Amino acid sequence: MLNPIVRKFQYGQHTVTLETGMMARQATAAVMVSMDDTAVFVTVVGQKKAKPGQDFFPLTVNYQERTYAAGRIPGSFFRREGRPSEGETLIARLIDRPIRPLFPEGFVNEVQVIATVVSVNPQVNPDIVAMIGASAALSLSGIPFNGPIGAARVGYINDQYVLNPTQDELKESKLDLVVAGTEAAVLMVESEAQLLSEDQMLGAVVFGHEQQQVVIQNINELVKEAGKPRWDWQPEPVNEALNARVAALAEARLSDAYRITDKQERYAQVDVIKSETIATLLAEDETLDENELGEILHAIEKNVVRSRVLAGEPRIDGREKDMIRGLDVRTGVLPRTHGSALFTRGETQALVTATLGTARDAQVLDELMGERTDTFLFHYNFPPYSVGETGMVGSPKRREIGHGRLAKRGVLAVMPDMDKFPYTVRVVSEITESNGSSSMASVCGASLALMDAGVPIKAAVAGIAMGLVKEGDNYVVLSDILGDEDHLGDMDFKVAGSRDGISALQMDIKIEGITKEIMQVALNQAKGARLHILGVMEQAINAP
Amino acid sequence: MLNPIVRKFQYGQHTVTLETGMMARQATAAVMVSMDDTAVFVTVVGQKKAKPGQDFFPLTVNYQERTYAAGRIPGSFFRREGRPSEGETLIARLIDRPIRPLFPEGFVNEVQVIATVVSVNPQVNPDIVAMIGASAALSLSGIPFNGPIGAARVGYINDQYVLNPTQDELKESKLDLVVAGTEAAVLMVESEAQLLSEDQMLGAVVFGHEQQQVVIQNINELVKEAGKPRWDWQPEPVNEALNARVAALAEARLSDAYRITDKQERYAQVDVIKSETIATLLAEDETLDENELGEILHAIEKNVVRSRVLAGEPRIDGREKDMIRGLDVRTGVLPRTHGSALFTRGETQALVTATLGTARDAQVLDELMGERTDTFLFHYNFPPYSVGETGMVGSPKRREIGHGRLAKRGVLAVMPDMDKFPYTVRVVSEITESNGSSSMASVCGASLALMDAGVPIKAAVAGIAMGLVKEGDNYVVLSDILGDEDHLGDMDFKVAGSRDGISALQMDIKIEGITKEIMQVALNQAKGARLHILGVMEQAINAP
Amino acid sequence: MLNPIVRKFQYGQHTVTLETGMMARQATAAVMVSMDDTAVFVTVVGQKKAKPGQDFFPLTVNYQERTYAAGRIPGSFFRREGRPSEGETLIARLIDRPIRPLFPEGFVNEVQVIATVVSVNPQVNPDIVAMIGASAALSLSGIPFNGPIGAARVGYINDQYVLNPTQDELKESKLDLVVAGTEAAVLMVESEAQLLSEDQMLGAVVFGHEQQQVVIQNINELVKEAGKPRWDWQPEPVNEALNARVAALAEARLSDAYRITDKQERYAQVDVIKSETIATLLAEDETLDENELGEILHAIEKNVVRSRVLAGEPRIDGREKDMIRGLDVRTGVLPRTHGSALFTRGETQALVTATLGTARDAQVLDELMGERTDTFLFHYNFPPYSVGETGMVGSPKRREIGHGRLAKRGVLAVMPDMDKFPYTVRVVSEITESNGSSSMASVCGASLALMDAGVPIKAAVAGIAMGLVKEGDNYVVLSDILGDEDHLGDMDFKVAGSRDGISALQMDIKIEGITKEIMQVALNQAKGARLHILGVMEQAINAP
């Protein structure tokens, strides 16, 4: 006989139960989460010795909702679920994003987080239930993983924050955000609100982070109770011999390379510097490990950008911190469509179109919690010609779907109700070129496309992404980040809203140690830039 | 003018016609086997040149069912037969399973045996017609094949046997099995029975094997008449200079490596030896093939386990040759689903669920013969976290479909009729951990899920797997085999049924020379092992 | 801030507008094309450096129609276009085919042509608009391209040729062809014509070629205005010391290798020479490249065949310049289906079947501009066993859909109306062996299958493909070419029709400098071979 080890704790209005060490033993980690009646079984499998020819951390999270959870036989032709829907893909991204940055730098081992829904209650979502599982299992696995993260859902009724609102409570609620992060700092946040202000939008993030602290403490006690011992992993020793040998040839040229304004001219230049430096090092001796060099050159690229921002020197394209790129607004680009828009910011632009139809063309979503019909439709396409390369095209990938739901949340608060406008609207965003924010601009393109179409929107809506360069305690907040300022930066602080308030913001932080004090600066500077986008948008069109 | 080579012979109540030499002359083999209204054109293509590193034998069988065989336009959006359905995959396995062990060891050349149905009779099933088709083609191809095999459906009407029962006669029949084997011995068997005794179930396998002998004789005469010259292929010359060089270094390590008992600790130890023995030989001589060294180590692994079980000595986990693994019967493990079950046998586990629905949720099967509705549903999911590896959560592999119907056949005889219980039942089996037989454990969890849901089944149903190790003429029968035992053994003898009779039986023999005398011993020992599972199941629940 | 470069002109009636320099700046080239209201946004991306291990030229043209162009929400389940349809792949091939031979010999850099429909007029067809867009983008990119090409649709109303007919004007027309080619010579060509004569079909190609000249002139002027400078590219230099080194060892017996008749004996002989020549050259020195030696051997294979045909020597299988291979006509090959046919030409055969149905079984094509329901279906299947190789079977390949419609082009014109025959007919072609033209042999098998089914077709239809060997100004026209005479040849000239007129005409030229006189001779010589097949076809069956 095998007996499981359990621990029960009160969380909000529901009693969350965690179980381990009875179901999957062959898997490195296995926990079964049960908020109140909704259960999600999460397993984490990680290899001890991965491949040697790996340069990227290969983490994959597969979220899947079982049909027997609600107690219904699937409506598919084969009577068996198959491909994940738009709902299941968004939750998969909601679990990956917070857990990714907690892994130590230099960890290249393949890990897979399989989260399957067991049972479901029509009141409690299982999003946040699955996020606790990936937080509990990964801490019990032994795999080097900081945290663990807490999962919290924030509501807003009567100008006051409510922890974990049900489906019936969400009908009267104004704000709907999911907050995740470690005990020390916040890590992500996915929001969907009405038109709240800047102060109350930040207060909900702090509220949820304080409430999720109960979950974090209960997992930590379970690690010392049933958790497997930590992996004996050590990062590759910092070779000071090569870090001065490569830098004496590359750091001098790469410092001058990051002053070019054009993206095409800069990326072609840094590729040449990376090519001939390795070519010379291979000509010296064939012992030097190729990849190794690729990470040293990448470390120099990170050091050149970050140090110049902290000192007070001009950015890549030679732009101050609170300064943004130039704007180009074009309404009515297509001839035989309902609505069309061409919004351009610097060197990134989105061809956004709007379509109108009857209520019969509504998307009938067969969700696990309940069957609902979606009136407003938003689609995000990211073709390879935007970044300037070749790739596969046909079916939308993870992001494509994630950024599409993001741009939907930023407009959903503005969109008129069915009582005034009873027509199904489909908005398609086509990324023509991409350098900084592609999900954001869109929201700017959607507002121009919906007016042009004839949709009576409440107020013009815009949005821009923010960044951060943090080293020690001091920090610099960036307005309208570039491609090199996001991949080498510390966070992708996306904010979208109207003239009055904020519709929806996405918080993606890569480092731990983020504070509420530096959150206010990033929130306030985004509002000043948001009004600047709208000042040019209202210059072209101001009425539907 | 083109000319065909025709052979006709009487087989039961049907006449079988074999044509070769005119259709698909470019392919190594092409045989047109069409009985009384219906046929399955089968072609074999084998590459003369083997891969560069190819180690395993790549055999791929694609069985597809054209809709114009019955004379009907397919009911789809594209109006064309696309990817194979649940049915098409099953027959493909009935073609792939008997032919695979007949290919000689050391043969790594890629071969493809595809079968396409070109016309069809509502009374004669295309499954055995395709099996004879592949048997005739592979023998006429020239590719090293130790066949040919015969195909026969046995059935059971009025305490008697009838060779290849028709679709109308199958409704009155209490048995439905397809037997495949050579002139010397049996090789496979896929069966479905309505609670039959061991003597009647064993006598059915012998009956079908004796009746299919005329098929083998008629194929052999065609090979002597219109057969392509056999391939000049010889296995790698076995040298004792390299074998004893590894055996004096690895056999001592591998002997203690199979005494570890625990799966995770055994596989970790057995991988270390493989990773070190090859590495130490490469340090001494780097001109040796790594691919050859792994095949020798696999032969040593085969010699250690088989010799220990051949003599009176406990196996890899400490069990005797009839002793079965420990049991953990659990039900009502999940809250918000109709039926819950948790079955664990030693180191294998299956989370089985039950779901109830109306006649609206019935599976509408669009088969080649005609449209029918399926009331009982069974799905088999095999995730990567079961064995402790990383894979694509995606699905569903073939083995997943083949084992899905396997467990469906074991419960179908137990399941109540439509009149007494007019509800469509959906059963989903989730493999939590895998070691030994997980398909037989799915049948044990199925009965527990149905009783928890409230489904009034006839009796309790259970299932176990049996193994064999034979060297010369003497044999040792194993009860409830482990994973490896299945790979390093000789046969996968699966038996599923109740206390009274057998509901399902699968016979997957990988070696020829199997005796009728040893089959009645393995089936009788399986009955005693099945009653042990059923006794513990009745302890937790004996009625719904 | 952002300025476009625009040039608009006239092309018969609808004014064609071309725009570049604003949309998609990151990519290599992006041109906004359109006529009246139909707009197709085409992008071309070319990679600077080639992949180390490349031997072939990777051209991947993908055409995607988006439903917001017409102003309609898609009728799909997810409400997203996604994967390319049956129609979308045909236009993708219609763009890929003419542009492929224009790339210089030796160029191996990966290029992608992404053409997407963004706006559409219900009268103007996007297919010719997308072809102009790709022609403009490839010329403005700088990537080595020997264009530009023009696109013209030719109709035939009241014995007169009409340039670019609208969808309403096509109902009166008896011809619908899409002609493509450079300023000096024609390239590809696909037609469909209710039994028209040779001079009518030939004159229509010349008509469209002369009318599309104004398009090419306006593209060339735009390149002179705002075109990115031509790529600094130079092909691999001719190795005089290596080309003679291989020839003095391989060319001697490779000349005798293309002398034997049988395909299986020839392809085994040309492979065994290559397997021995390269093995000896690698043993002599290991500094040589694997792919470089194969390119010289292929040049020998090309030179041996072409030199014999041009001089006046007998062909590979011992045929004359106008001689057609042996024919085998069989019908009623299958028992339990409506239509059955087994047509064989030389060593190529197609198992063609005809299936009868009702109006309920008709395919509803959700095309961009249109709601038409197709009553006639044609499906082409090219399995791996036809060529004697091993591959993967699943979703119909681009080559299968292209030949499927191409075989449909010849049958649709001769088929009876819905008023006299109100049954939906499905035709499925199965290629069992292939060497010459299996797509045109499917048309011959289609007429035999329909007569066996009972379809009252107006006349019998047959056809063959034509080849040409031209290196100077003198030419040799070949009737019914092989696989070796098509790859090493210069053009693929497909003709299909009845005893009175031509139903289908396809033109696939790989070389520049095609004259008017060689196009009519290849068409007139095809008529003689077409009458030969129909004469043998009438011997078996003449009336249903």
Numbering used by the authors:
A (entry chain A), B (entry chain C), C (entry chain B): 1 to 544
Verbatim from the authors:
One widely occurring ribonuclease with such multi-functional versatility is polynucleotide phosphorylase, a phosphorolytic exoribonuclease (PNPase; polyribonucleotide nucleotidyltransferase; EC 2.7.7.8).5,6 PNPase processively cleaves single-stranded RNA substrates in the 3′-to-5′ direction using inorganic phosphate to attack the phosphoester linkage at the 3′ terminus and liberate nucleoside diphosphate. E. coli PNPase core forms a homotrimer with a ring-like architecture that encloses a large central channel. The two RNase PH-like domains within each protomer are spatially related by a pseudo-dyad axis, so that the PNPase trimer has approximate dihedral symmetry D3. In the current study, we solved several crystal structures of E. coli PNPase core bound to its cognate RNase E micro-domain, including a complex with O2′-methyl-modified RNA bound and another with manganese in the active site.
